[PDB]
Design a protein around this ligand. Structure first.
Ligand SMILES: *[C@@H]1O[C@H](CO)[C@@H](O)[C@H](O)[C@H]1NC(C)=O
Ligand SMILES: [Ir+3]
Ligand SMILES: [Ir+3]
Length: 155
């Protein structure tokens, strides 16, 4: 689970800066104790793009098989991840799994600061699809000379 360094821009100004490792867990079997399919987002094989905004942004990460979409909202003061979507193709059998969590308050951080959380974070997107983050340090909206803000933590 290698940590990727991602970035979203408004022409030249920094809109979103995100470092993290991301894993997708799909539950093949109806039995909750049965093994699951793991998929590591490989950062050297993943395209970051996304859309900046005064009150709402998104970091989208695309890879062969699908994507992970992190949507940010700033309430002011403070910003947070307000939505998470994912899409993942498995070759055999031949399934696309996907899911979106719509109304969440996640990694909420005082505006102008950065969020850090090296500890594994987790979110059920659908009933079978789960996303896990690790080694997270990110920041959105307010920036100062392309550096991480006054920092914060989770647990
Ligand atoms: C990513 O999120 C934005 C809203 O923040 C949305 O417009 C876009 O459709 C999403 N992308 C995907 C592929 O889910
Ligand atoms: Ir599903
Ligand atoms: Ir939190």
């Amino acid at each position: 689970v290698k940590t990727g360094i991602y970035q979203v821009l408004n022409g030249s100004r920094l809109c979103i800066k995100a470092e993290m490792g991301i894993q997708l867990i799909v539950q093949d079997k109806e039995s909750v104790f049965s093994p699951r399919r793991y998929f590591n987002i490989d950062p050297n094989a993943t395209q970051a793009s996304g859309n900046c905004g005064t009150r709402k942004s998104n970091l989208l990460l695309n890879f062969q098989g699908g994507f992970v979409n992190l949507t940010f909202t700033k309430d002011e003061e403070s910003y947070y991840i307000s939505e998470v979507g994912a899409y993942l193709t498995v070759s055999d059998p031949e399934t696309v799994y996907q899911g979106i969590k719509h109304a969440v308050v996640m990694f909420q951080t005082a505006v102008g600061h950065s969020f850090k959380c090296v500890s594994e974070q987790s979110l059920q997107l659908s009933a079978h699809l789960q996303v896990k983050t690790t080694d997270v340090q990110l920041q959105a909206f307010d920036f100062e000379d392309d550096h991480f803000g006054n920092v914060d933590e989770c647990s």
